């Protein structure tokens, strides 16, 4: 409902996706949480609770039941390269399928259900097509995620596209979280961010109308070298980019 949003987080058994799933129904009481995972093994990893659905984002009908009744969607799915040290993408699970088409299917399902806001987590690097991450497995993942992104901006539903810096497994809530535009942060050395702060930015984006129709790159500063961002109003405000 308008005042108690059902929020579906997809890739909920993922590393960032799981903290997003807990902060939706825990650190928060302003949401009814729903999660989408790719397997039964993923559903157990996160508790195996009732509000978790199983589906494959490459088969739209298998994920449609997850969208029924939702008000917002946080996409935290990604093609994931596997190593045979040389990495590769399993068949039918390449970035084109998982990240372009896989996301396309989520975004269409959401429009159907009348979502008032789709949040997508991507990666810095998209302004550079020759970026090293595209070689990892022969996928060009960064370009494919950009195609999904542009499709999201193109759909008509209010969106928030969050292009994160290198992901870190470090405590959230205790850093100077930086926000930029067009890979510029890659010139710096403050181009990486804890998973927990990305999970927090998705949750906050749900609370501030300012995040609507915005696209920004997200990085942070070392811990201890600044006051923990606690005021997200300001954080989103400095973002005027739509893409």
Ligand X SMILES: NC(=O)c1ccc[n+]([C@@H]2O[C@H](COP(=O)([O-])OP(=O)(O)OC[C@H]3O[C@@H](n4cnc5c(N)ncnc54)[C@H](OP(=O)(O)O)[C@@H]3O)[C@@H](O)[C@H]2O)c1
Which residues here bind ligand X, judged by CB under 6 A?
11, 13-17, 37-39, 42, 56-58, 76-78, 80, 98, 102, 121, 123, 164, 166-167, 195
H-type alpha helices, the chain = 15-24, 40-45, 60-67, 95, 102-113, 141-154, 195-207, 232-237
Kindly name the residue from 123, 155, 220, 241 that is annotated as catalytic.
123
Nearest residue relative to ligand X (C-beta): 14
Q: Closest CB to ligand X among 123 and 204?
A: 123
Rounded least distance, CB 57 to ligand X, Å: 4
C-alpha 98/C-alpha 194 separation (Å) is 24
Rounded least distance, CB 153 to ligand X, Å: 17
Q: Which residues contact 100 (CB under 8 A, 6 or more apart)?
A: 144, 145, 147, 148, 151
Q: Is 241 a catalytic residue?
A: no
Rounded least distance, CB 3 to ligand X, Å: 29
Q: Closest CB to ligand X among 77 and 204?
A: 77
Q: Closest CB to ligand X among 15 and 22?
A: 15
Q: Which residues contact 61 (CB under 8 A, 6 or more apart)?
A: none
Q: Closest CB to ligand X among 11 and 227?
A: 11
C-alpha angle with apex 119: 113 to 120, nearest 5 degrees?
115
H-type alpha helices, 114-140 = none
The catalytic site residues sit at 123
């Amino acid at each position: 409902s308008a005042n108690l949003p059902t929020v579906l987080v997809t890739g909920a058994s993922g590393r960032t996706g799981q903290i997003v799933y807990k902060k939706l129904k825990e650190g928060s009481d302003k949401f009814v949480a729903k999660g989408l995972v790719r397997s039964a093994q993923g559903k157990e990893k996160i508790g195996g609770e009732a509000d978790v659905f199983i589906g494959d984002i490459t088969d739209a009908d298998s994920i449609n039941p997850a969208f029924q009744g939702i008000d917002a969607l946080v996409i935290l799915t990604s093609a994931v390269p596997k190593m045979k040290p040389e990495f590769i993408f399993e068949d039918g699970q390449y970035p084109e399928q998982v990240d372009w088409i896989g996301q396309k299917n989520q975004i269409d399902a959401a429009k159907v259900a009348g979502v008032k806001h789709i949040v997508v987590v991507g990666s810095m690097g998209g302004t550079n097509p020759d970026h090293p991450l595209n070689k990892l497995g022969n996928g060009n993942i960064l370009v494919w995620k950009r195609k999904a992104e542009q499709y999201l901006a193109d759909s008509g539903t209010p969106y928030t596209i969050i292009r994160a810096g290198g992901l870190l497994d470090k405590e959230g809530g205790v850093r100077e979280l930086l926000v930029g535009k067009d890979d510029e942060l890659l010139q710096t050395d403050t181009k990486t961010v804890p998973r927990a702060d990305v999970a927090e930015v998705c949750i906050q984006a749900l609370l501030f109308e300012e995040a609507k129709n915005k696209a920004f790159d997200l990085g942070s500063k070392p811990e201890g070298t600044s006051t923990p961002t606690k005021d997200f109003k300001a954080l989103f405000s400095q973002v005027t980019s739509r893409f």
